Amino acid sequence: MIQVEENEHIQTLVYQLNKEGKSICGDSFFMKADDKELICAVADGLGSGSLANESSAAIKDLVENYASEDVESIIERCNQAMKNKRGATASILKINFEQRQFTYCSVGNVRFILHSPSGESFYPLPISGYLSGKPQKYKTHTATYEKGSKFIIHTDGLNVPDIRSHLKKGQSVEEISNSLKMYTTSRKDDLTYILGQLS
Ligand SMILES: [Mn+2]
Numbered sequence: 258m259i260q261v262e263e264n265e266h267i268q269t270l271v272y273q274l275n276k277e278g279k280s281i282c283g284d285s286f287f288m289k290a291d292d293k294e295l296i297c298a299v300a301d302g303l304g305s306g307s308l309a310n311e312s313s314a315a316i317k318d319l320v321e322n323y324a325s326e327d328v329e330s331i332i333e334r335c336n337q338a339m340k341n342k343r344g345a346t347a348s349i350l351k352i353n354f355e356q357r358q359f360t361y362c363s364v365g366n367v368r369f370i371l372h373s374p375s376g377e378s379f380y381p382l383p384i385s386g387y388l389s390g391k392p393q394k395y396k397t398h399t400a401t402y403e404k405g406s407k408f409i410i411h412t413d414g415l416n417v418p419d420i421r422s423h424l425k426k427g428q429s430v431e432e433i434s435n436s437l438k439m440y441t442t443s444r445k446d447d448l449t450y451i452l453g454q455l456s
């Protein structure tokens with residue numbers, strides 16, 4: 258499933274496919290942007306199937322409802338919601354268009370790679386473990402981005418040899434998505450990615 262949306266400040270593309278012969282995606286995503294800010298989140302429920310989706314959809318819903326709060330605060334509420342659920346890995350990203358600034362909070366193997374046309378990249382190593390409901394250290398990265406920045410957030414279903422070069426050489430989220438298409442066909446796992454090109 259490919260979903261594209263743009264406004265003045267960001268062109269986005271979301272790609273989501275279910276694990277082979279599964280009827281429900283274990284991964285979730287949330288995406289909302291208006292003229293001031295963007296919020297998005299990608300979550301991978303443990304395992305797959307409906308109870309993976311139960312955990313990842315609950316994260317999706319919390320991000321939506323608490324979108325006004327800061328990232329750490331939202332991720333906390335997600336951890337709480339994972340009590341007696343399978344749990345999930347997830348990343349949450351807020352962008353303030355007016356300040357060209359982002360805050361990022363993640364737990365587990367969901368990956369965020371930002372590429373700036375000035376060659377600089379932001380590529381935070383993922384926090385170990387998952388959102389299980391147990392007490393969890395959270396870390397927020399806050400940073401300025403450059404006009405023309407290209408980023409991806411993706412679950413571990415997307416395994417690409419050199420994901421940064423794709424972000425570099427592609428000139429639109431469409432181009433980048435197409436260069437990655439060949440890594441999306443195995444269906445060994447649910448596969449979700451968000452691509453953004455920032456004005
Ligand atoms: Mn999963």
Ligand SMILES: [Mn+2]
Nearest residue numbers: 301413414446
């Ligand atoms: Mn996965």
